[PDB]
Structure 1
Amino acid sequence: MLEQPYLDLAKKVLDEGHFKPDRTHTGTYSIFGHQMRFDLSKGFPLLTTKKVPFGLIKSELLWFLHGDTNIRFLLQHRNHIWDEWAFEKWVKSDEYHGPDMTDFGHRSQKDPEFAAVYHEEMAKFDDRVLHDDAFAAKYGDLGLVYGSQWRAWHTSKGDTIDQLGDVIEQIKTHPYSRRLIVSAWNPEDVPTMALPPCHTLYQFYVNDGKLSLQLYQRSADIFLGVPFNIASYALLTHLVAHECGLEVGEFIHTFGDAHLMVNHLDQIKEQLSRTPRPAPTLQLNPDKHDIFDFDMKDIKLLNYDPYPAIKAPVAV
């Protein structure tokens, strides 16, 4: 089907990746340099062989698109993808008084006890950010996150560039530009960052009135990360194609070090048992075009029929 390349990417790593140790010394099977294409005219690449939550995908993209960097928008949509990065700062801080939460990363993984004190202090932090304004400002803003890299890149001369809004301008005016690139990799910030971006950059390409997109993704978790990353970019590709009035062409996904966590082998094997079903369809508010002022309701998924979801332990 249309997910096939995702599945070939996973088989390829199973019976061809060498063992590579990683940071959280879980170890991993890894290959380097891979590239898939999805033809977005054939359907939208949300995996059917397993249940991916579109809603989390949507809220995060829109959050990136509004150029927002503050957790609060997400929590408002019940999207917690980014909580630990914000909460970490709370924890490592003066105004913080409480159960030390040092490397709660692991220590909530080996300890049902601790993991109820954490999955609990979190519960409040999140609530605080929702309710206390000045709190959200201090703790819920993340600073350097896709939203601000795409929409407000800091110049050395103190101003801010809206790369993404600029490139779309150019797409309407010089469709054939070979220079239609958005980068999230800042070399001054990149040493002092908790997670220098995974999605290093992307490039638009237009021809025969179709828009394409290729993503350079430095590092991929095949099981957990990639099924999400594919949907965001594909969505992005559509929104842009909508705003510039083009048709959608392809989304190309290039990887650097694409890997499987060594303890995801069972799960990913189970998945390879399943047989893809036809892909869902994407659908856009034909009235609204300014994609920056786009809302949950303006974007919607048709005919999504996935296999059950698959629990996998997450790497700490």
Structure 2
Amino acid sequence: MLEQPYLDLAKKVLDEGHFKPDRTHTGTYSIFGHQMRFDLSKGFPLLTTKKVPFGLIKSELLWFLHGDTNIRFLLQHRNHIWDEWAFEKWVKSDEYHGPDMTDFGHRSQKDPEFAAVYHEEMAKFDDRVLHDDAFAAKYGDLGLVYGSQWRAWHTSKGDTIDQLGDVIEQIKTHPYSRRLIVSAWNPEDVPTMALPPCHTLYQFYVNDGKLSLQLYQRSADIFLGVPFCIASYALLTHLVAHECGLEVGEFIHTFGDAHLYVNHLDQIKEQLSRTPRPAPTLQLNPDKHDIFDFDMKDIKLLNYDPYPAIKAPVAV
């Protein structure tokens, strides 16, 4: 089965993972250096042993591909994955006149009524973003996110480089190149970032008319993150390929610090009692070729028969 590597990584961490604490003060089980391989010609690696929302995955990837960094687009697509980051900037800034949200993410799990106040406060902020173009302009723009890291790298001369755009052009002109790399790591920015990119660097490769892609993830949440990441990068390996007119080869996920939060142990064991079903299948619109102009309707997932969704808490 196509998703075996993910189960193995999960089992493995459970078995060889050494205890290791972190920022959130919640302990974890970590390993260092791992590498999975998913033959993308066998099917699309969307977990069948637990329901993963492909809709959110598409929304987020297209956002990146547009070089966009404002929440407004994602919001219009019912995507709220990046809300806390915008919200957090709104609460620590001027004008915010409302219940003190200091430590909203952490407290939400503990104070019940607080969760109520915060959830509506959030609901309001999002509405303002979504409608007040002025507000969106200053609170919905996350700044340094994958969208601007891949397609608008700031140069020392006050200019901008479209890493993804250029790399794609190169795949077309020099497929056998070894410099097909897109970095999301800027030494100038990381020192003062809310969250340096976990999806640190990827590189393309072409051989036998097939496109492959390797992603280097400095840090991974095996339960919550990895499941999205695989699908997210597997989608791109499909997009770029389609555009360049190659076939799809395999996705290679290399890990730095792969961990499993102690509060996710039961749930992950719960998933390990499942037997993966046949993998779903991606269907891309044949009329469109400019991935930069792709839309939600141009990507279709067929035969997605998963197990119910396994619920687990976000440990900040």
Name the TM-score class by shorter chain. over 0.9
* Worse-superposed segment, 106-115 or 58-67: 106-115
Distance 1:312 1:40 in 2: 28
Distance 1:119 1:4 in 2: 37
Length, aligned pairs only? 316
Shift of 1:36: 0.2
Shift of 1:104: 0.7
Shift of 1:109: 1.1
Shift of 1:313: 1.2
Instruction: After superposition, give the CA deviation of every residue in 1:245-281 in whole Å (9 maximum; x if it has no partner).
Output: 0000000000000000011010000000000000000
Distance 1:23 1:112 in 2: 24
Shift of 1:105: 1.3
Distance 1:14 1:109 in 2: 25
Shift of 1:151: 0.4
**Is residue 72 from structure 1 mapped to residue 107 from structure 2 by the alignment?**
no
User: What SS class does the counterpart of residue 113 from structure 1 fall into?
Assistant: helix
User: What SS class does the counterpart of residue 110 from structure 2 fall into?
Assistant: coil
Instruction: After superposition, give the CA deviation of every residue in 1:223-263 in whole Å (9 maximum; x if it has no partner).
Output: 00000000000000000000000000000000000000011
Instruction: After superposition, give the CA deviation of every residue in 1:33-72 in whole Å (9 maximum; x if it has no partner).
Output: 0000000000000000000000000000000000000000
User: What SS class does the counterpart of residue 121 from structure 2 fall into?
Assistant: helix
Shift of 1:106: 1.1
Instruction: After superposition, give the CA deviation of every residue in 1:81-133 in whole Å (9 maximum; x if it has no partner).
Output: 00000010110011111111001111111011100000110000000001100
Any gaps of 5 or more consecutive residues in structure 2? none
User: What SS class does the counterpart of residue 112 from structure 2 fall into?
Assistant: coil
Distance 1:313 1:85 in 2: 18
Any gaps of 5 or more consecutive residues in structure 1? none
* Worse-superposed segment, 100-109 or 49-58: 100-109
| Root mean square deviation, CA, Å | 0.4
Shift of 1:297: 0.1
User: What SS class does the counterpart of residue 38 from structure 1 fall into?
Assistant: strand
Aligned to 1:161: 161
Distance 1:235 1:211 in 2: 12
Instruction: After superposition, give the CA deviation of every residue in 1:282-308 in whole Å (9 maximum; x if it has no partner).
Output: 010000000000000000100000000
Shift of 1:315: 0.4
Aligned to 1:127: 127
Matches within 5 A, 1:139-288: 139-288=139-288
User: What SS class does the counterpart of residue 312 from structure 1 fall into?
Assistant: coil
Aligned to 2:59: 59
Shift of 1:206: 0.2
Distance 1:21 1:94 in 2: 34
TM-score by length of 1: 1.00
| Percent of matched pairs sharing the same residue | 99
Distance 2:94 2:42 in 1: 53
Distance 1:2 1:108 in 2: 37
Distance 1:120 1:4 in 2: 40
Shift of 1:314: 1.0
Distance 2:130 2:259 in 1: 36
Distance 1:93 1:25 in 2: 26
Structure 1 stretches of 4+ with a deviation exceeding 3 A read none
